Write a protein that binds this ligand. Sequence first.
Ligand SMILES: Nc1cccc2cn[nH]c12
Ligand SMILES: Nc1cccc2cn[nH]c12
Ligand SMILES: Nc1cccc2cn[nH]c12
Length: 305
Amino acid sequence: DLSSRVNELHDLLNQYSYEYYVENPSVPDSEYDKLLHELIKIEEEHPEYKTVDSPTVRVGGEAQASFNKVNHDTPMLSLGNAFNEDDLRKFDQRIREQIGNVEYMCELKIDGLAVSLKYVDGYFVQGLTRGDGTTGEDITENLKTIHAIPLKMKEPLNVEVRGEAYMPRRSFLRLNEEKEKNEQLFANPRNAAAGSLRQLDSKLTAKRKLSVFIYSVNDFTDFNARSQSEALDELDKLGFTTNKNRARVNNIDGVLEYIEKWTSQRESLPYDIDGIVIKVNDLDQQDEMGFTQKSPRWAIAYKFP
Ligand SMILES: Nc1cccc2cn[nH]c12
Ligand SMILES: Nc1cccc2cn[nH]c12
Ligand SMILES: Nc1cccc2cn[nH]c12
């Protein structure tokens, strides 16, 4: 009986949540809240309209995260480090000696909490902490409260994406301010985000302002991407939140320019970064480079001093 208004509230809340948490709102907080409250009331009085990907999932539930030890479908990578220009030049020289001139993708390394996010038939069904890279903790219920994480992708794929969960600097500072006025302060946004995702109650996680950036996928089968940068664009089209500050560059001069630029611009960002990740862009060329015992030979994490 209430299908039209429920579908209308789904459509409006999903569009508004995307514009705010992924993109410029077209609507004030008061309008989002009013529509959210109305959907919550319909679902309380008519629970047959509840759905797995309802916008009301974002406020958190009674069901708690299990924190069960769960294996990733595919182990998560450990990156080798660079600490100066020389290290980047060595890494570039190792690659060009072996496979020739390559295009690099450069990305900001968010000072966040690494997660794997598993999608089955396009639905978000499992979110794990990175753990030891092989085994993680099940924090699905808490991750579901993060609006930047789609509950349902644009296409019904079976994929495991890798992301960095984080707390925006402004939200971190405002939280410590509330603590200062009333409690012990969090040391940094990373610790505040970790505290928020360790809650027994997802309703507590929901009242913290968290976001994510997706940086990779486990499996490129259902992707038409030939490169890391194309794969991130494809992820955008599928409904995920990626970091827009990535760049394709032709050579090591380009990589150095991007590091020097972001050294000077990192204070301007709304999140903490601890580095810059540089990767061979082409997927076939990443494959050609292969791995060491621990780490890809086609990627490196430059770390700020
Ligand atoms: N933390 C990370 C590990 C492996 C790859 C990437 C890409 N951006 N951040 C990454
Ligand atoms: N990450 C997302 C993808 C598509 C729609 C929405 C609404 N909130 N977050 C979304
Ligand atoms: N890592 C940090 C510690 C204390 C304050 C701030 C603000 N942005 N990042 C911060």
